[PDB]
Design a protein around this ligand. Sequence first.
Ligand SMILES: *[C@@H]1O[C@H](CO)[C@@H](O[C@@H]2O[C@H](CO)[C@@H](O[C@@H]3O[C@H](CO)[C@@H](O)[C@H](O)[C@@H]3O)[C@H](O)[C@H]2NC(C)=O)[C@H](O)[C@H]1NC(C)=O
Ligand SMILES: Nc1nc(N)c2nc(CNc3ccc(C(=O)N[C@@H](CCC(=O)O)C(=O)O)cc3)cnc2n1
Ligand SMILES: [Cl-]
Ligand SMILES: [Cl-]
Ligand SMILES: [K+]
Length: 205
Amino acid sequence: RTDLLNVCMDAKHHKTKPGPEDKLHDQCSPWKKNACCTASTSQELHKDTSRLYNFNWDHCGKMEPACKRHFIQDTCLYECSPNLGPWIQQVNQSWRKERFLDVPLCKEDCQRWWEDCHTSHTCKSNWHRGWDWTSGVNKCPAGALCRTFESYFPTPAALCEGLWSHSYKVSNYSRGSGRCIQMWFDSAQGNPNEEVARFYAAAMH
Ligand SMILES: *[C@@H]1O[C@H](CO)[C@@H](O[C@@H]2O[C@H](CO)[C@@H](O[C@@H]3O[C@H](CO)[C@@H](O)[C@H](O)[C@@H]3O)[C@H](O)[C@H]2NC(C)=O)[C@H](O)[C@H]1NC(C)=O
Ligand SMILES: Nc1nc(N)c2nc(CNc3ccc(C(=O)N[C@@H](CCC(=O)O)C(=O)O)cc3)cnc2n1
Ligand SMILES: [Cl-]
Ligand SMILES: [Cl-]
Ligand SMILES: [K+]
């Protein structure tokens, strides 16, 4: 229960423990009061093919800004959230010992993400496994054609749930209900996802 709260997962860049980061860059700044990412990490993850994982979002031509902002926001959450304890799973990968499974993403966040990416393209419905890495950057592998986002993600859930091997599940709860993790939030009344982590930590027990 409580041991799942306010933790950082054992992954490539994560800090060991949550802590204030007043200099979090741009989109990551709402995490500045309590975060699992360093300022350095937040700065780098905004860049195209950043040194974080050498991951290229423009693998099928340039990805539109309206769409890119969501992938950037998603990376901020992955790298900076101290509130995903309840969904942390043990995996034995070379670059992380842990990851998330079935984080209850607010349906609107997923809907908006999916909608904003319609004009963009990709060659894969899962961005976690199957890329051609031989060049040092992910490239479209054999058998993978470039298509519109909707071809590979026919619905919002296909995007949010398929993208990183089910790191998210789409929650039927809405933004501000306190019953789902929000990707996008202002920290006016603090981080809305603490309450959420606290709720499921107990509810999933
Ligand atoms: C996900 O959440 C939404 C609510 O945000 C759920 O929608 C509601 O579903 C019920 C039926 O299961 C709808 O009810 C039918 O509604 C009409 C009234 O408009 C009523 O006359 C019928 O007797 C019947 O109850 C209800 O309208 C709908 N809510 C809204 C605001 O439209 C949905 O069920 C949830 N999904 C799951 C899988 O739980
Ligand atoms: N929940 C969540 N949210 C994110 N934003 C997120 N972003 C990334 C981006 N960083 C990546 C790093 C490595 C790979 C990689 O080496 N893939 C191999 C699999 C084999 C292996 O494991 O080596 C392949 O292509 O076959 C792919 C992506 C990764 N996970 C994420 N998870
Ligand atoms: Cl807008
Ligand atoms: Cl693996
Ligand atoms: K959070």
